[PDB]
Design a protein around this nucleic acid. Structure first.
Ligand code: MG
Length: 835
RNA sequence: CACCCGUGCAAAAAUGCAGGGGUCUAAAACUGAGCGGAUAACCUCUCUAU
RNA sequence: CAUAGAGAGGUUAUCCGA
């Protein structure tokens, strides 16, 4: 169940000096101060419209009782007594990595004797983590077409300086320029059309490649983003993301050109596309002015302002209109627009008059301790919503049902348009460089990744804004240092990101390149009259083909489709009803038997199977097989990439905390030579002649750098794993994770697997096979040899090897546990702890 | 069935009960979002064809 | 500038399994 304190209305508890402050939830992700306690002495802020009242206040915590919605009473622990019980004074808590003073001194001027700034700093760190992961994914997608260049690319040089490599007398950069030249002109550049292709007029319009300057600028921006996020830059370059206004003119121009296209393609046709909707709404909103109504419609549909009010308008409308038989065939043709107008009416009803009703609904939602209440309150609200808006819904339905009158209302243009355009999407000349760079980064990833990245950024920026508002209200110092003053405008950035969330979609395949992708689509199934044209047409339009090609070589995907255990596991993840539907679509008998038959059929898909009695039967069968194959391989590849993202997070965190600990005064040494120097430095052990001679002692655990390694058992376990690791193996693992070499070489690394129990096991088997292949002709330590022999003998990933080469993350115990023991890696598959 | 912290109780150096964690792990609450298919209208540029 | 028929893209629903 969820936290009862959060449901009671307690947002957070902040320790400032010897006093403590308790906040409350507000409109959206806002915070309101109402309670200050100084050693069992309570003073109430927010004298009017309170959120909760504290019953008993003690040094050990505070018991509170809420007033919003359900009167749920809970208890909250005192932050000033953290780490100070049964072992004897009040002190401001520190982060578990013992890096709070260093982070405060870095992002701000000095230490602040409170636990508010550190949360903002950790939100910034989360922003950097997610940016690192998705920039690494984008770089891998851009590099996959090769079937070095993207590592040394920096924005300090423009295309004019890069062009001097034509006559360069040194081969080191001549090879780089040759690689750049080979990059352009590649047919695989047809993907990512919005990043490399632009529309051109006939003197009809066709998509053509941009000039070399713009392509180089895009590549440089992406490469520098990856280099800055993944690595720990030193000097001015470490502020590259937060000083994007200092970029050269070429990069700004390419960012503006990339960003302006969707905006100019969305707000230009807004009036014409939704004409009938505004006409009907004006008919039913007789009193409201037309300009204000169209402004509200634009803010509701294009900007999608109905997805951040706290509740779900869609759920309320669904639970309201279900009673009346609008789901019947009678309104089948008009359902699409009628429902949209219903949600619009609901939205304008909750922002003009029923603001208090919306606040009550969101309060009841927040105070619920389970899922049963979250539906009962929705139904209760929907009853009143029906009883109030039945007439308006009926009027809209009858107006839309008049297809004759609908056509009569479509050919007449009387809308005021050149006035009140301030609601339109801001062009590239008004948005910040950070948002444009984020959009350019998103132009290289799949839609789910885009949604995850944008939502995470919006949430973190909202967190930063709320914390800044809290600090301003409390009177605390919040002036960032001169290098991070960008974050002072964070609120504005949040808006842009929210605005960016309105219209950002996946990338579009170029229309003219529909023939160049014929070979890739025809070869992803490994085929090689005119039936192959049908197969290519039915493969290209699949949404999973984009992911399968942008993130994998089609021939390699076809080769890895022969791994029967892997495909069998992916089919096992699919529920029984879906498997039955697939079998009935692909063929004219238990669930497991049908799953095995499907896994056998997909493994040797051939041209004979497609060719081989109605034309409306064999065509659907071939389509079903094609779509099933594409779905299976897409799921496998996507989950493998998502698993690799976690280790990308881990290595970025390792680099960042290495730099932070080195700044904090800990002798960590260089990290490029050995990636596990953080863990030894935190423990305090040294590589005496290449091995850790020191054994376990309780004193070493008692004097660890951070609270993570202050438990004797986990200290001993991680030290033992360290003594069983190898520097070269760790470096190769880091390179494989950062460059996604395991996923790229999936053809070979999956050849001789026996059984797959989860995606974690498959990914680590791939990595272990890659490590064995790279070290097949090199001298390795006895532990690595034992691990490789065990992997070869069992033909399954070795968990001890995972514990061995994941030791660089050992300084963070929770991350190490999550990334080593299977069953704790994925939150969607909660397993059992093996240790 | 993760990690850390608080409090009661058994102990004697750890078990249990009940909680908290934005300052632990992709990871605070409402919501936005991170799951997969199989059909539907409606708009735009046509492009022979009416 | 009506009906047949293609592509290619916008939003939007509703249906079952989680
Ligand atoms: Mg966090």
């Amino acid at each position: 169940t969820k936290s009862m304190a959060k449901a009671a209305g307690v947002k957070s508890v902040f320790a400032v000096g010897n006093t403590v402050y308790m906040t409350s939830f507000g409109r959206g992700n806002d915070a309101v101060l109402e309670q200050k306690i100084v050693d069992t002495s309570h003073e109430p802020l927010n004298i009017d419209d309170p959120a909760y009242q504290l019953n008993v206040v003690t040094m050990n915590g505070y018991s509170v009782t809420g007033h919003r919605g359900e009167t749920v009473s809970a208890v909250t622990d005192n932050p000033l007594r953290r780490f100070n019980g049964r072992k004897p004074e009040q002190s401001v808590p520190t982060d578990m990595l013992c890096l709070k003073p260093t982070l405060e001194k870095k992002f701000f001027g000095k230490e602040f004797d409170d636990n508010i700034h550190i949360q903002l700093i950790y939100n910034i760190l989360d922003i950097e983590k997610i940016l690192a992961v998705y920039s690494t994914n984008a770089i891998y997608a851009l590099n996959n077409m090769s079937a070095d260049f993207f590592m040394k690319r920096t924005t300090d040089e423009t295309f004019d300086d890069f062009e001097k490599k034509k006559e360069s007398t040194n081969s080191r950069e001549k090879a780089d320029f040759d690689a750049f030249e080979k990059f352009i002109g590649n047919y695989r550049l047809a993907y990512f059309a919005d990043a490399f292709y632009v529309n051109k007029k006939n003197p009809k319009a066709k998509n053509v490649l941009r000039e070399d300057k713009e392509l180089y600028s895009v590549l440089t921006l992406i490469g520098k983003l990856r280099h800055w996020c993944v690595h720990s830059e030193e000097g001015r370059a470490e502020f590259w993301l937060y000083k994007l206004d200092e970029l050269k003119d070429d990069f700004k121009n390419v960012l503006d050109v990339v960003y302006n296209r969707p905006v100019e393609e969305i707000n230009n046709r807004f009036i014409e596309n939704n004409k009938v909707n505004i006409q009907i709404l004006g008919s039913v909103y007789k009193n409201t002015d037309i300009a204000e109504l169209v402004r509200s419609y634009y803010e509701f549909l294009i900007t999608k302002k109905y997805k951040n009010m706290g509740f779900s308008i869609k759920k309320l409308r669904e639970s309201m209109l279900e009673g009346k038989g609008y789901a019947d065939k009678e309104y089948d043709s008009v359902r699409n627009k009628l429902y949209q107008m219903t949600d619009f009416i609901l939205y304008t009803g909750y922002i003009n008059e029923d603001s208090d009703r919306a606040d009550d609904l969101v309060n009841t939602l927040r105070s619920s301790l389970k899922e049963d209440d979250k539906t009962t309150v929705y139904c209760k609200e929907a009853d009143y919503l029906w009883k109030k808006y039945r007439e308006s819904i009926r009027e809209v339905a009858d107006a839309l049902d008049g297809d004759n009158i609908k056509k009569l209302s479509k050919s007449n243009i009387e809308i005021q348009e050149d006035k009140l355009r301030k609601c339109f999407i801001s062009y590239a000349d008004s948005v910040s460089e950070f948002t444009k760079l984020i959009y350019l980064l998103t132009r290289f990833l799949s839609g789910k990744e885009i949604n995850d990245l944008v939502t995470t950024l919006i949430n973190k920026f909202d967190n930063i804004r709320s914390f800044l508002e809290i600090m301003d209200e409390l009177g605390l110092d919040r002036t960032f240092t001169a290098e991070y003053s960008f974050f002072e405008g964070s609120t504005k950035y949040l808006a842009e990101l929210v605005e960016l969330n309105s219209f950002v979609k996946s990338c579009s395949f170029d229309i003219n390149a529909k023939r160049t992708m014929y070979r890739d689509a025809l070869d992803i199934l490994g085929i090689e009259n005119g039936l192959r044209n049908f197969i290519a047409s039915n493969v290209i339009d699949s949404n999973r083909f984009k992911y399968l090609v942008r993130y994998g070589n089609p021939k390699k995907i076809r080769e890895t489709a022969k791994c029967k255990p892997a495909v069998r596991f992916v089919l096992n993840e699919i529920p029984d009803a879906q498997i039955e539907r697939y079998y009935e679509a692909c063929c004219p008998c238990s669930a497991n038997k049908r799953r095995e038959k499907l896994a056998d059929m997909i493994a040797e898909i051939k041209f004979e199977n497609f060719s081989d009695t109605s034309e409306a039967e064999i065509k659907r069968k071939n389509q079903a097989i094609i779509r099933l194959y594409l779905t299976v391989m897409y799921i496998m590849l996507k989950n493998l990439v998502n698993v690799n993202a976690r280790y990308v997070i881990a290595f970025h965190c390792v680099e960042r905390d290495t730099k932070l600990y080195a700044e904090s005064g800990l002798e960590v040494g260089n990290i490029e030579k050995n990636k596990t120097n953080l863990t030894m430095a935190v423990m305090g052990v040294k590589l005496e002649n290449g091995i850790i001679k020191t054994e376990f002692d309780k004193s070493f655990a008692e004097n660890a750098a951070n609270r993570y390694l202050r438990n004797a058992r986990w200290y001993k376990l991680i030290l033992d794993n360290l003594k069983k690791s190898e520097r070269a193996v760790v470096n190769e693992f880091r390179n494989t994770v950062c460059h996604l070499n395991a996923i790229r070489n999936i053809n070979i690394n999956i050849k001789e697997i026996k059984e797959v129990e989860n995606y974690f096991a498959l990914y680590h088997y791939l990595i272990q096979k890659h490590l064995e292949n790279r070290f097949a002709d090199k001298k390795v330590e006895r532990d690595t040899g034992d691990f490789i022999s065990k992997l070869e003998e069992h033909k399954t990933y070795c968990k001890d090897f995972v514990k061995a080469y994941c030791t660089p993350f050992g300084y963070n115990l929770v991350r190490y546990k999550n990334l080593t023991i299977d069953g704790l890696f994925d939150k969607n598959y909660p397993g059992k702890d093996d240790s």
